[PDB]
Design a binder for this molecule. Structure first.
Ligand SMILES: Nc1ncnc2c1ncn2[C@@H]1O[C@H](COP(=O)(O)OP(=O)(O)OP(O)(O)=S)[C@@H](O)[C@H]1O
Ligand SMILES: [Ca+2]
Ligand SMILES: [Ca+2]
Length: 174
């Protein structure tokens, strides 16, 4: 169930109601442990819930954790490193894909370190429409606070040395 280094995997995101949200066709595995999966992708096909497709324009390093309710996408744009963080179930991985539930809230981090919590409106609507249990609401709000602290502390994928190591490792394997 732990992906191997050099493996190309699919990533499948779902909503709480079981519907597919988004699928990324190809991510190369850089690190696979029981707790952490790091991958890189570049010009991967992306499929939306209506089947519509688009191809990513730039490389990304992706960070998944088995014990935290978020995952982190690290983007290399012309004026520096952008992060897009999903609030989410932790991941599971099987032969089909690395899989998680998308829980609406998102955090964007700019090259200057500024972060913004996005999609409180999306979250409120979906939590009512799909009847998220109280304990999911508590865990997600706890994990928003944990993720803001990781960003402020430059912990995990927010460490500049993390970016140096994995961006170079992906450039070599690709
Ligand atoms: N797994 C991924 N691999 C590569 N790029 C990704 C990945 N996930 C997100 N991105 C990039 O991160 C940015 C935001 O991701 P989106 O696909 O917009 O996700 P999202 O923010 O969860 O959207 P909503 O709120 O569900 S419509 C875009 O630049 C994406 O290309
Ligand atoms: Ca999201
Ligand atoms: Ca969202």
């Amino acid at each position: 169930s732990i992906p191997k280094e050099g493996e190309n995997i699919k990533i499948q995101s779902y909503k709480h109601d079981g519907k597919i949200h988004r699928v990324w066709s190809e991510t190369t595995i850089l690190k696979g442990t029981d707790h952490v999966v790091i991958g890189g992708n570049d010009h991967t096909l992306v499929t939306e819930s209506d089947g519509r497709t688009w191809i990513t324009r730039e490389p990304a390093i992706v960070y998944f954790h088995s014990e935290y309710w978020f995952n982190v996408i690290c983007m290399f744009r012309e004026d520096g490193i952008y992060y897009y963080c999903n609030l989410s179930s932790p991941f599971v991985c099987d032969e089909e894909a690395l899989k998680y539930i998308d829980y609406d809230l998102d955090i964007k981090v700019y090259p200057n370190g500024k972060y913004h919590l996005l999609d409180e409106d999306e979250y409120e609507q979906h939590m009512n429409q799909m009847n998220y249990p109280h304990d999911i609401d508590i865990i997600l709000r706890r994990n928003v606070d944990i993720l803001q602290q990781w960003i402020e502390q430059k912990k995990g994928p927010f460490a500049p040395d993390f970016i140096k190591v994995w961006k170079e490792r992906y450039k070599k394997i690709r």
